[PDB]
């Protein structure tokens, strides 16, 4: 059956060369596909790390917010004191005060006047 | 009696002009207190409003922190799904490729089986 | 002779269908992969553009925060100007009172008249 | 004659002692208000610095955000650049495959035609080997 076997191989050749074509096309695709898919995962990473940076820039601006608050609150309190003391310390000045030291200078002047009469 | 009249008169004269001089001072020092009273109130009323300012600043910022908690939690999920689709297609592709790979490995046994039927039928 | 042409043609029919089947088995694979692929890609596209919307959302939360800061600064500035002025007007108005008080030391009038009284009442 | 001289000069000295009393008191008050003015103004100068330090920080943080926002937007350009890139590759894949199929279907030079030919070529060979 040599005639049958010779034409049996000539058919499979027809087949497999055809199928070889389709496979070379799939290899080329895959290779190309996976290459670009790989660098795409890299860029996808940076794009999330840039999502990070912005989201950190806000939390930073949040901290500023509270620091200013505290600062504001510390300044107002320092002023209030300074003022409360000033007021206290004038109240002590009023207690230190003279209208009798006036009576004394007046009394003396009275003595002086009586004498010379 | 004459002398004792004049003693009394000057003592009187001095008392009265004591009260005068002391009222003079009293009136000024009270003018002064009015200025300082008016001052510290004005003063206090601005410290009062600086404190309202600070609280309305707090509340406005407390509300941003909550809004940012929201947008961040969504943005984080949005970020997780993008890596998930990433895993999904790499898999769809790798599968499609093994299937075509396995298809080739399986590929032919019916061709020879037909030739053998045919040859047997030609015999 | 005539039979073998008949079996030959039947054999060619089975071969043809064998080839056509597998060919159609490949292209079902190619079509189901390329349909999946497209479905995800379109999806992932939307889920990419959704990240931007969340990102543009944050730069608006950012500019809002910045806007809050400009107003607290302006107000703080305006408050400090109010207070510096109240204090300045205070100080000034003490200076003003101190001038009117060089009139008071009035005491010299009291002391004159007292003298005159005492003088006349012993001379 | 000497009496009248004694009462004048006694009143004057008594008068400048009264005035001096009032004077000292007023200087004492003045010194307080001075100090308080200093302490006050000191806290105003700090508060003024605090304002401008807050502003400088937030002005810097906003530029960092400007820059990082551009850097972000370029990264979306990159993303959709990979989209098109991948879409093309797959599309050209499918084109390549339909071309391969169209060529494998040519009635004259397809793969069935090459099959039939060799089949007929076997048949002709088998029937002359009998005759």
UniProtKB/TrEMBL annotation, chain B:
Q: What is this protein called?
A: Synaptonemal complex protein 3
First and last residue shown, out of the full length, are 105 to 234 of 254
Question: Any coiled-coil ranges, and where?
Answer: 18-67
Keywords carried by this UniProt record: Coiled coil
Is ATP-binding given among the entry's keywords? no
Similarity remark: Belongs to the XLR/SYCP3 family.
XLR/SYCP3/FAM9 domain ranges (all copies): 1-121
Q: Looking at the UniProt record for this protein, which Gene Ontology cellular component terms does it annotate, in alphabetical order?
A: lateral element
Signal peptide per UniProt: none
Instruction: Please tell me the species this chain comes from.
Output: Mus musculus (Mouse)
